[PDB]
């Protein structure tokens, strides 16, 4: 029984804050609350302990990441760029 049709987790805010604000917060709330797959254990048990801090339920390993996502586009792009820079510099 699909309870709503457009609003999802953001429905807890009721008829407040405006539609555009609610739809903009909804995607980030989904991202920050959905559990992700840990790259160290494989279990989908990554939860946002605090702002920018992600924790593994089973691995019990803490990973610094984005405020609302496990890893941002800037972070992964920088990581790839630094890896290539190290390869180019050290041959």
């Amino acid at each position: 029984a699909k309870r709503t049709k457009k609003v999802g987790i953001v429905g807890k805010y009721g008829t407040r804050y405006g539609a555009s604000l609610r739809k903009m917060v909804k995607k980030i709330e989904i991202s920050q609350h959905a559990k992700y797959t840990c790259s160290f254990c494989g279990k989908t048990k990554m939860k946002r302990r605090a702002v920018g801090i992600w924790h593994c339920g089973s691995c019990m390993k803490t990973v610094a990441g984005g405020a609302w996502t496990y890893n941002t586009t800037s972070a992964v792009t920088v990581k790839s760029a630094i890896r290539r820079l190290k390869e180019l510099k050290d041959q």
Partner: protein, 154 residues
């Protein structure tokens, strides 16, 4: 009261039998149990902090040190980073493009943590109500309920 996470890294003191503990600005991609190398000879990867004079141009660093021995004062906010554009072996100075858009010349002996500061994208999520704002600013300082000047008396 800080938008960026901290990482407690423990080193072994080379001059006496003890384990020093320090707090660095966390760069996303780092995790507990990871070996972080600090020094001139440390290789270029996310997490390590090495002087600017060694890293090549175009690199991305955080917790930039304004002066040699300053312990890091530049580019240490969530999601912010500094790009190294060019070097100058004579006078040992390197130009760095700060996140505000200005480029500053910096001595090539101070260190910088490689990578971007974790916790980025915080501004993307809109604060939704006075409750979020009140809790955001109560931790930092009493500056939130700003009354506009025109509403005041002369």
């Amino acid at each position: 009261g800080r938008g960026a996470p901290l990482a407690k890294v423990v080193f072994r003191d080379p001059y006496r039998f003890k384990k020093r503990t320090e707090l660095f600005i966390a760069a996303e991609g780092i995790h507990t149990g990871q070996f972080v190398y600090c020094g001139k000879k440390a290789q270029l990867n996310i997490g390590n902090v090495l002087p600017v004079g060694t890293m090549p141009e175009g690199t991305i660093v955080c917790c930039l040190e304004e002066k040699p021995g300053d312990r890091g004062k530049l580019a240490r906010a969530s999601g912010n980073y500094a790009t190294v554009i060019s070097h100058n072996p004579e006078t040992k100075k390197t130009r760095v493009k700060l996140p505000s858009g200005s480029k500053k010349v910096i001595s090539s002996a101070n260190r910088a943590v490689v990578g971007v500061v974790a916790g980025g994208g915080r501004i993307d999520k809109p604060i939704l109500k006075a409750g979020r704002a009140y809790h955001k600013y109560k931790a930092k300082r009493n500056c939130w309920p700003r009354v506009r000047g025109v509403a005041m008396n002369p």
